[PDB]
């Protein structure tokens, strides 16, 4: 029979006021004989209607994939409102329900600290510039690198690790050609998180 999967908005979308966050209620393993679905969406127990059905995808294992997207306000989400999708289909003796929401827990400001390469990496061809984000709750975050207004793409980031105070931490690392680090260039580490002033902070790093 059919199955339901309810996914949250991207952290960026909930944090950039100029983006458009949305929950996505996916329905897989959907039969040809009764492909029809009903969605009812509820926000904090109370029904809403501005749902939308994205176009039906044929799966090539003979099942259909029907998906419902609900748009949601930034502030509703960030205040921990609960979003319930309910799915009903003829091949499903009882409707299925799923809830999601922001992880419950008092929000905590991330502490952001940049870190120059080891005197020891200096020999090697390429160097690692580190951004450390610690002491943040909840774990929904975005980290980006840049220099002179411009995105640097050779970075990598660790999944948020649970600390022993109950907060989260991660390290983001960017690799540049050594000479560039030498050449006086200035790199920036951009962190977007809810418990921050304007959901955004930035930190720079350079030679000395």
């Amino acid at each position: 029979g059919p199955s339901v999967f309810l996914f949250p908005p991207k952290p960026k979308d909930t944090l950039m006021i100029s983006r458009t966050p949305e929950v996505t209620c996916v329905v897989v393993d959907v039969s040809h004989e009764d492909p029809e679905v009903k969605f009812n969406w509820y926000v904090d127990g109370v029904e809403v209607h501005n749902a939308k059905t994205k176009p039906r995808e044929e799966q090539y294992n003979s099942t259909y994939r029907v998906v419902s997207v609900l748009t949601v306000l930034h502030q509703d989400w960030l205040n921990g409102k609960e979003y319930k999708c309910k799915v009903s289909n003829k091949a499903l003796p009882a409707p299925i329900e799923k809830t999601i929401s922001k992880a419950k827990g008092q929000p905590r400001e991330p502490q952001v600290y940049t870190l120059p390469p080891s005197r020891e990496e200096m020999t090697k061809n390429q160097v690692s510039l580190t951004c450390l984000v610690k002491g943040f709750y909840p774990s929904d975050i975005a980290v980006e690198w840049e220099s002179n207004g411009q995105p640097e793409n050779n970075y990598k980031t660790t999944p948020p690790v649970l600390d022993s105070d109950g907060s989260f931490f991660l390290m983001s690392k960017l690799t540049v050609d050594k000479s560039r680090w030498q050449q006086g260039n200035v790199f920036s580490c951009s962190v977007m998180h809810e418990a921050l002033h304007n959901h955004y902070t930035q930190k720079s790093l350079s030679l000395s």
């Binding site: 944090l15 950039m16 006021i17 100029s18 980006e144 840049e146 207004g149 995105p151 951009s190 977007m192 002033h197 304007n198 959901h199 955004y200």
Partner: peptide, 13 residues
């Protein structure tokens, strides 16, 4: 104040 990201508005309180 307001924060901008890659010249795209992030947030204003």
């Amino acid at each position: 104040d307001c924060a901008w990201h890659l010249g795209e508005l992030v947030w204003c309180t």
